[PDB]
C-alpha cells in the first residue's frame, strides 16, 4: 500500500563530530606569520536557526592542536641562534653593593671568568652581572643549567609580543560557534552559527592570572569540569578588566663579547644610578569589587551561608608558585600574596604593590633538558595589562568544616588556551542521504 | 520597492528547515565539499578530502545515479526500516533527525541498490542484443 | 571543472547544449560572424565579463529540470 521507494539525495545538511587539522589565517616574531595564510577582510558567519548542538570544552581537540603548534613554533624560532656551550666555566663572583636598597641585597652577583675568542689559541678575561637565581655555588659559582644540559640564547631580533591567530578548517568540515550567553562550556547550546574561522586569539603565556584576554559580555563566569571534585581547576572569567602596571626600573646596559667566528654573547655591563626591585601595581578598590563579584558568583554553587576564603599558593616550583609572565623580553616572576588574602562572610587611590623578581634562564614549557637564555634589555622597562580571569583550586573541601578556601593555580598552558576556544567545535559534513519517495526508475 | 532587503540561505542555513524545504538547496552544499612538516599535514588533509569526494562519487555511479542530485530508484521501501508516512517525514522532520533514525539500516540499502543496478545493466544489455 | 560540468547536466559530454536562452545583451553578433570569422581566444576576451551569471542560470535551470523530471516520474 505504501509503494514507497528508496531515493538518494546528495548535498543534505548533516554533520558528525570529527577531528582534523586546521590551518592559519592572520592579518621578526616568535609566532611566525610567514607560514600562515592571510585572513579574509570580511569574515562570514551563518546563523543556524532551530539548531541546538552539544558542546564540551573539556574534550576539545583544538586545544591540543594549539598547544602542539605553539610548542613547535617556539622550537623552530630558536634553531638559527647561538648555542652557549662555552659558558660552562668556573666563575668568580662578588656581591654588588653600590647604591642598593634593603630588598635588593644579594640578588645580583658580579662574576668574572675566562672566555674563548675568535682565534682558537687565545683567551680573554671578562665579567658580567648575573642574578642570584641563575648561579649556584660550586667564591666559585656555576650556571644553574650546566649539570643538566647546554642550551641556547634567543636571537636579539625576534620579538616575544603575541600576535592574533585565526584557525580555519579544511574543505568538507565546518566550525560551529555557540552564541548563547551564560553558556558554561558544557551541555546543549540552542543558538549556533557556522564560521569559516575563529576570532584572533593572542597566545599569551602566564600563570595564576589571564592577561589580555576576552571578557564575559554579561557577568562573571565560573567553569569547572566537575565542581564537586577538588582536584579540578576552576576557570573564572571576569566581566570587566582590572588594570595592572608592571615595571623594571634599573637602567641596564648591554655589551657584546665575541666568543668565536660570528658568535656573540650579550652580557649585562653595568647599572646606571640606583638599583631597585621591579614590581607591579593593581588598584585596590577595583580588586575588592572584582573579588566581591567572584564570591557572589561562587556562592551559587557552594551554598548561600558558606564562608569563602582566599589564601596563598601551596608550594612547588617558582613557575607555579608565582604569577610568571614576560614584559618586553624580560621574564618576571611575581608574588601574588597581597591579592588572594581575605575572608568573606555571608551577610581611594592607594594600590596593592607586588614586589617581584626577574630571570634569564628559562624553561618555558614543562620540559627538562632545554633552556632559553634571554639577553638583557637596555634601559628601563614598563608595561600595562588587563586582568580578565583567574585559575583557582579548592583545597581540602571535606564536610567537617563549612569554610571554603580557594588558592591560585596554573602551570599547565592548556588551561590558557581552553578559556578562548570554549565556544567553538569542529564537525564534518555527510552529504549522502536516503529517503522514501514515490517515483520509480 | 525601495527600503527592502534580500537575503539567501547560505551553506548550512537549511539545517533546521524541514526535509522538503531543505531539498531545494542541495547545490550550495555540494559545491562546498571540494573547496616543511606542516605542509605534509596540509597535503594529507587535501588528499583525504579528494579521496572522500571520489568515494562518494564512485558510490553514486555504482548505484546508477551518476551526475544527479536527486535520483529515485527501483528498490522498494521495506516497512521494517520505517513506518512513518510521507506526511510526517517531508513536512514534520529534518534531515538530522532522519539520519539519526535510519543510521542502523544504511548498508543493506546500499547493497540492494548495487545488486539492483547490476540487474538493470544486465537486462539493458540483453535488450540491446536483440 | 568536472563538478561544474556535472552540476549543469552536461556530465560525460564534450559538446552539451542546454536550455538557457541567449540574452542579446551579452553579444549582438550573429552566428555567421562568430563561428566562421573569429577564434576562441577572441571570444573569451569578448565575453570575459558575462561568465558567472550564465553559470548561475545554468545551475538554476538544471535544478528546475531535475525537479520537473522527478515530478513527471512520480505519476
Amino acid at each position, epitope marked *: 500500500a505504501e509503494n514507497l521507494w528508496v531515493t538518494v539525495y546528495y548535498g543534505v545538511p548533516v554533520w558528525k563530530d570529527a577531528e582534523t587539522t586546521l590551518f592559519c589565517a592572520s592579518d621578526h616574531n616568535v609566532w611566525a606569520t610567514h607560514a600562515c595564510v592571510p585572513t579574509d577582510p*570580511n569574515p562570514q*558567519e551563518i*546563523h543556524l*536557526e532551530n539548531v541546538t548542538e552539544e558542546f564540551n570544552m573539556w574534550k576539545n581537540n583544538m586545544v591540543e592542536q594549539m598547544h602542539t603548534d605553539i610548542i613547535s613554533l617556539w622550537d623552530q624560532s630558536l634553531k638559527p641562534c647561538v648555542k652557549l656551550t662555552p659558558l660552562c666555566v668556573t666563575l668568580q663572583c662578588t656581591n654588588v653593593t653600590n647604591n642598593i636598597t634593603d630588598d635588593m641585597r644579594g640578588e645580583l652577583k658580579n662574576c668574572s671568568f675566562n672566555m674563548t675568542t675568535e682565534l682558537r689559541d687565545k683567551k680573554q678575561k671578562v665579567y658580567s652581572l648575573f642574578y642570584r637565581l641563575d648561579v649556584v655555588q660550586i667564591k666559585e659559582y656555576r650556571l644553574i643549567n650546566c649539570n643538566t644540559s647546554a642550551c641556547t640564547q634567543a636571537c636579539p631580533k625576534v620579538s616575544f609580543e603575541p600576535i592574533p591567530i585565526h584557525y580555519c578548517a579544511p574543505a568538507g568540515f565546518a566550525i560551529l560557534k555557540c*552564541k548563547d550567553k551564560k553558556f558554561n562550556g558544557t551541555g546543549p547550546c540552542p543558538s549556533v552559527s557556522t564560521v569559516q574561522c575563529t576570532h584572533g586569539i593572542k597566545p599569551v603565556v602566564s600563570t595564576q592570572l589571564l592577561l589580555n584576554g576576552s571578557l564575559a559580555e554579561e557577568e562573571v563566569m565560573i567553569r569547572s569540569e566537575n565542581i564537586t571534585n577538588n582536584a579540578k581547576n576552576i576557570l573564572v572569567q571576569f566581566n570587566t578588566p582590572v588594570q595592572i602596571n608592571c615595571t623594571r626600573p634599573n637602567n641596564n646596559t648591554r655589551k657584546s663579547i665575541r666568543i668565536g667566528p660570528g658568535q656573540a654573547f650579550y652580557a649585562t655591563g653595568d647599572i646606571i644610578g640606583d638599583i631597585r626591585q621591579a614590581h607591579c601595581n593593581v588598584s585596590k578598590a577595583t580588586w575588592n569589587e572584582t573579588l566581591g563579584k567572584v564570591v557572589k558568583q561562587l556562592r551559587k554553587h557552594f551554598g548561600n551561608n558558606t564562608i569563602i576564603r582566599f589564601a596563598n599558593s601551596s608550594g612547588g616550583d617558582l613557575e607555579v608558585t608565582t604569577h610568571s609572565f614576560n614584559c618586553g623580553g624580560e621574564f618576571f616572576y611575581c608574588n601574588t600574596s597581597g591579592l588572594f588574602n581575605s575572608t568573606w562572610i555571608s551577610n581611594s587611590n592607594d594600590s596593592i604593590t607586588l614586589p617581584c623578581r626577574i630571570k634569564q634562564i628559562i624553561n618555558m614549557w614543562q620540559r627538562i633538558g632545554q633552556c632559553m637564555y634571554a639577553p638583557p634589555i637596555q634601559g628601563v622597562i614598563r608595561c600595562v595589562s588587563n586582568i580578565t580571569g583567574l585559575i583557582l583550586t579548592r583545597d581540602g573541601g571535606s564536610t567537617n568544616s563549612t569554610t571554603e578556601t580557594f588558592r591560585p593555580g596554573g602551570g599547565d598552558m592548556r588551561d590558557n588556551w581552553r578559556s578562548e576556544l570554549y565556544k567553538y567545535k569542529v564537525v564534518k559534513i555527510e552529504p549522502l542521504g536516503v529517503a522514501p519517495t514515490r517515483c520509480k526508475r | *520597492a*525601495v*527600503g*527592502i*532587503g*534580500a*537575503v*539567501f*540561505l547560505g551553506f548550512l542555513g537549511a539545517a533546521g*528547515s524541514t526535509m522538503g*524545504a531543505a531539498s*531545494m*538547496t542541495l*547545490t*550550495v552544499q555540494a559545491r562546498n565539499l571540494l573547496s616543511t612538516v606542516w605542509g605534509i599535514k596540509q597535503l594529507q588533509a587535501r588528499v583525504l578530502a579528494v579521496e572522500r569526494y571520489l568515494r562518494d562519487q564512485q558510490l553514486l555511479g555504482i548505484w546508477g545515479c551518476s551526475g544527479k542530485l536527486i535520483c529515485c530508484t527501483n528498490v522498494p521501501w521495506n516497512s521494517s526500516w520505517s513506518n512513518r508516512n510521507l506526511s510526517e517525514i517531508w513536512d514534520n522532520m529534518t534531515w538530522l533527525q532522519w539520519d539519526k533514525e535510519i543510521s542502523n539500516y544504511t548498508q543493506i540499502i546500499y547493497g540492494l541498490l548495487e545488486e539492483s543496478q547490476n540487474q538493470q545493466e544486465k537486462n539493458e544489455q540483453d535488450l540491446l542484443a536483440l | 571543472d568536472q563538478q561544474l560540468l556535472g552540476i549543469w547536466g552536461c556530465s560525460g559530454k564534450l559538446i552539451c547544449c542546454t536550455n538557457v536562452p541567449w540574452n542579446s545583451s551579452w553579444s549582438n553578433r550573429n552566428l555567421s560572424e562568430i563561428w566562421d570569422n573569429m577564434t576562441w581566444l577572441q571570444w573569451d576576451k569578448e565575453i570575459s565579463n558575462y561568465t558567472q551569471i550564465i553559470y*548561475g542560470l545554468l*545551475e*538554476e535551470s538544471q*535544478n528546475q529540470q531535475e525537479k520537473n523530471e522527478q515530478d513527471l516520474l512520480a505519476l
Partner: antibody
Amino acid sequence: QVQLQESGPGLVKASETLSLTCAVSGASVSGNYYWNWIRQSPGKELEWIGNIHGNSGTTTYNPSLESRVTISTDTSKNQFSLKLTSVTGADTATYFCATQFKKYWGLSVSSPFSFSDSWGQGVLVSVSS
Amino acid sequence: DIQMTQSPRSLSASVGDRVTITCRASQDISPDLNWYQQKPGGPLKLLIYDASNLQGGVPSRFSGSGSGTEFTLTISSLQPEDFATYYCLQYNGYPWTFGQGTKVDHK
C-alpha cells in the same frame, strides 16, 4: 530570528544632541539589510526618521529632518546609532529601531517568498527646556 | 511625499463583529503596502504584507485586499485581543508615511 534592543538617555536638554543606539542579535549589521529609525510622539502619528543600508552604508533621511539626522553603524559592537542635533520640545517621543527584508528559500530572486520584519521595544525620550 | 488617509479614525465594535478599515494613498503604490497592529504601550505587530499576503503566525481571521489607491483590512470575527490601533504603511517611495491609526476598542 532577528532581535533588536534600543538604548539611550531617557532625558535630554533643549538644543543638545540626542544619541540613541540599537543592538541587533541573530544577524550582522554589514549584511544586506535596511536598518530603520522611526519615532512616535504621544498621541500622534508615527514619523519615520531615516534609514541606512548595512552593506553599502547609503543613508536616506526624512526631508523634514534631513538637516539634523545622522545614522551610523558599528560592526565591532554589532549595532547602529542615531544622532539628532538641536532637539526641541516636539522631539519628545518613543523611538524605535526596525528592520524588514525578504528571505528567499532558493537561488536568485525568483524562488517562493518569506517576508520578515523586526521592531524593537522602543525607548521613550523627553526633551526638557 | 505620498500622503495617507485612513478611515474610520475611531471605531467601536463588540466581540465577533466584522471590522473594516480603509486606507488611501495620494498616488498608485500597489502592491506595496503593509498593515500593522499596535497594542497600548507595545510594539507594532505586522498583520499583512503586500496588502494581500497574511504574515506567518497571524490568525486567519485577518485579511487584506484592494489595489491602486485604495486598500482594505478586514477582521471577520473580532476578538478580545483585537482591540488595538491599526496602521497602513507604504514603501514604494521615500519617505515612509504611516496612517493616522484606526483605533478599535470594546463597545
